[PDB]
Amino acid sequence: EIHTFDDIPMPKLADPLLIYTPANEIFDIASCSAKDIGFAIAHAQIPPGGGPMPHIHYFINEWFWTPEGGIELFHSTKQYPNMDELPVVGGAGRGDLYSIQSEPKQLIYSPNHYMHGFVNPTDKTLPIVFVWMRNEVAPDFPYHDGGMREYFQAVGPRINLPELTNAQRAAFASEAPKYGINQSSYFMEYVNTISDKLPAQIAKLKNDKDLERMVEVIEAFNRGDKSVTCS
Amino acid sequence: EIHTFDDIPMPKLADPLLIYTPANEIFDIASCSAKDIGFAIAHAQIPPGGGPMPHIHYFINEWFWTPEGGIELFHSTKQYPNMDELPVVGGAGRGDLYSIQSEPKQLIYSPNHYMHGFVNPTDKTLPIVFVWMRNEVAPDFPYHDGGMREYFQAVGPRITDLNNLPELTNAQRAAFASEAPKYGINQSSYFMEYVNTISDKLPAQIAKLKNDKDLERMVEVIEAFNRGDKSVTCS
Ligand SMILES: [Zn+2]
Ligand SMILES: [Zn+2]
Ligand SMILES: [Zn+2]
Structure with a gap:
C-alpha cells in the first residue's frame, strides 16, 4: 500500500556542494543534465524541527525519499x-x-x-x-x-x-x-x-519511470560517463 | 456561542513597558494587583504572520479579546x-x-x-x-x-523607537x-x-469556556488605578 524505493545514490562531485538552507536543512546538493533531462538532487540531514514551510512548485516535479522514515x-x-x-x-x-x-x-x-x-x-x-x-x-x-x-x-x-x-x-x-x-x-x-x-488522491501519486531515468544519469556520472554532466 | 466584551482598558503607566516579543508582537504591557487578585495585561499589535507558536500555561488563566476580529x-x-x-x-x-x-x-x-x-x-x-x-x-x-x-x-x-x-x-x-x-x-x-x-x-466544549466575573474584577482594578485609587497598583 505504501510505495518504497531501494536507493537513490548521490552524484559524487570532486568538490561537493554543501549548503545550510534557511529552513534548517543540511544539504549536499548537485545538478545533473543529459539529453532531454535536467534535475537537482540533495542528500539532506534534517535537525529536530527543521523543514520548509508549505510551498508550491511551478518549474519542477519532486520526489521525497526517507531512508529512515520519521519525517x-x-x-x-x-x-x-x-x-x-x-x-x-x-x-x-x-x-x-x-x-x-x-x-x-x-x-x-x-x-x-x-x-x-x-x-x-x-x-x-x-x-x-x-x-x-x-x-x-x-x-x-x-x-x-x-x-x-x-x-x-x-x-x-x-x-x-x-x-x-x-x-x-x-x-x-x-x-x-x-x-x-x-x-x-x-x-x-x-x-x-x-x-x-x-x-487516496495523494496516496496514489507515483512516477518511478522518471526517477529511474535520473538514477541511470547519476550512476552514469559516477561511473565516469562523459555523455552526462553532474556539477 | 460567541462571547463578546465591550472594552478592556489599558492601565496608563507613567513609564509604559513596550516590548517586541520574539513572536513578532508589539506589546504595551503592565502588571497590576490588589488584595484579592494579580495579573498582567497587554494591548498588542500583531503584524501579518505574527503570534506565538502553540503553548500551555501553568501559572495563569488567559483571556483574548479581539476588537477587530481577523486573528x-x-x-x-x-x-x-x-x-x-x-x-x-x-x-x-x-x-x-x-x-x-x-x-x-x-x-x-x-x-x-x-x-x-x-x-x-x-x-x-x-x-x-x-x-x-x-x-x-x-x-x-x-x-x-x-x-x-x-x-x-x-x-x-x-x-525604544517605533520607527x-x-x-x-x-x-x-x-x-x-x-x-x-x-x-x-x-x-x-x-x-x-x-x-x-x-x-x-x-x-462546543471549547466554545463554552468563559469567566466574565474575574475579567470584570480586573477591569475595575485597572479603572481604579487609572483613577489614582492608591488601593491598587499597576506598574
Ligand atoms: Zn550549460
Ligand atoms: Zn518542494
Ligand atoms: Zn498563552
Missing part, C-alpha cells in the same frame, strides 16, 4: 496551476493539508502545483533525499536543472554549521518566485487545516 | 495538567487543535492547562488584548502577577522557548512540535 510530510489534494494566485486569506484562499508519517525507504512523489512541506517532529536528526526534475515549462538556468540548485545556492550559506540571519530567512520566501516557487513565510500562511487522514 | 486562534479540547510531560512525539503526544476565526470584540477564555496559540493570517496589522491572571498555584514574582510580564520582559527587547523596531536574534527566539518553563509555560519552538492536527470545526 512528517504535508501535502494537498488541491492543485494550484496559477503562480500569480497565492493561496492566502486575502484572496485565492488558504488550503487543506494532509500529513504523512514517513516509513523507511518510503518514496513520495509530488507533481508541480501541489502544496507540500515537511518537518522533523522528533528529537534526532534524520536523513532525506530530494530530487527536483525540470518540467516542460521551466525556463533555462545555468545548470539546466529547473532552478532548484540555483535557488538553494542563492539564499543558503555555504557550510561546525554557519548561522542563519533574518535576511536569509526572509529571502527564502521572497526570492522563491524567481525560481518557480511560491514559498510561505510562516506555517499557517497558506493553510486552513491539517488532517491525519490520507486521501 | 485566528488555535485551542485544544485536551488539558495538560503536568508541566513535566511535554506534548511531543515520543513523549505524552502531540494534540489536536481547533481554529477560531475571531469576530470583532470576541472574548476567548483559555484556562490553565489547555494548549493554545494564534496568528494574524491577514496582510494587515491587527490589535489584540491579553489578560493573564495569576492562578492559585503560581509562585511569588516581583510583580505578583503570576509571571507573564516578567517572562516577556526577560525574553523580549525593549522598543526602528529591534532586530530579533536567533538567541532571543530560542530563549522565547527555553526560558518559558521558568515562567510556567511550555512553549513550542515550531508550529508542528506540539500539534497532531488542526481542524476548523470548533467543539
Whole structure:
C-alpha cells in the first residue's frame, strides 16, 4: 500500500556542494543534465524541527525519499496551476493539508502545483533525499536543472554549521518566485487545516519511470560517463 | 456561542513597558494587583504572520479579546495538567487543535492547562488584548502577577523607537522557548512540535469556556488605578 524505493545514490562531485538552507536543512546538493533531462538532487540531514514551510512548485516535479522514515510530510489534494494566485486569506484562499508519517525507504512523489512541506517532529536528526526534475515549462538556468540548485545556492550559506540571519530567512520566501516557487513565510500562511487522514488522491501519486531515468544519469556520472554532466 | 466584551482598558503607566516579543508582537504591557487578585495585561499589535507558536500555561488563566476580529486562534479540547510531560512525539503526544476565526470584540477564555496559540493570517496589522491572571498555584514574582510580564520582559527587547523596531536574534527566539518553563509555560519552538492536527470545526466544549466575573474584577482594578485609587497598583 505504501510505495518504497531501494536507493537513490548521490552524484559524487570532486568538490561537493554543501549548503545550510534557511529552513534548517543540511544539504549536499548537485545538478545533473543529459539529453532531454535536467534535475537537482540533495542528500539532506534534517535537525529536530527543521523543514520548509508549505510551498508550491511551478518549474519542477519532486520526489521525497526517507531512508529512515520519521519525517512528517504535508501535502494537498488541491492543485494550484496559477503562480500569480497565492493561496492566502486575502484572496485565492488558504488550503487543506494532509500529513504523512514517513516509513523507511518510503518514496513520495509530488507533481508541480501541489502544496507540500515537511518537518522533523522528533528529537534526532534524520536523513532525506530530494530530487527536483525540470518540467516542460521551466525556463533555462545555468545548470539546466529547473532552478532548484540555483535557488538553494542563492539564499543558503555555504557550510561546525554557519548561522542563519533574518535576511536569509526572509529571502527564502521572497526570492522563491524567481525560481518557480511560491514559498510561505510562516506555517499557517497558506493553510486552513491539517488532517491525519490520507486521501487516496495523494496516496496514489507515483512516477518511478522518471526517477529511474535520473538514477541511470547519476550512476552514469559516477561511473565516469562523459555523455552526462553532474556539477 | 460567541462571547463578546465591550472594552478592556489599558492601565496608563507613567513609564509604559513596550516590548517586541520574539513572536513578532508589539506589546504595551503592565502588571497590576490588589488584595484579592494579580495579573498582567497587554494591548498588542500583531503584524501579518505574527503570534506565538502553540503553548500551555501553568501559572495563569488567559483571556483574548479581539476588537477587530481577523486573528485566528488555535485551542485544544485536551488539558495538560503536568508541566513535566511535554506534548511531543515520543513523549505524552502531540494534540489536536481547533481554529477560531475571531469576530470583532470576541472574548476567548483559555484556562490553565489547555494548549493554545494564534496568528494574524491577514496582510494587515491587527490589535489584540491579553489578560493573564495569576492562578492559585503560581509562585511569588516581583510583580505578583503570576509571571507573564516578567517572562516577556526577560525574553523580549525593549522598543525604544517605533520607527526602528529591534532586530530579533536567533538567541532571543530560542530563549522565547527555553526560558518559558521558568515562567510556567511550555512553549513550542515550531508550529508542528506540539500539534497532531488542526481542524476548523470548533467543539462546543471549547466554545463554552468563559469567566466574565474575574475579567470584570480586573477591569475595575485597572479603572481604579487609572483613577489614582492608591488601593491598587499597576506598574
Ligand atoms: Zn518542494
Ligand atoms: Zn550549460
Ligand atoms: Zn498563552
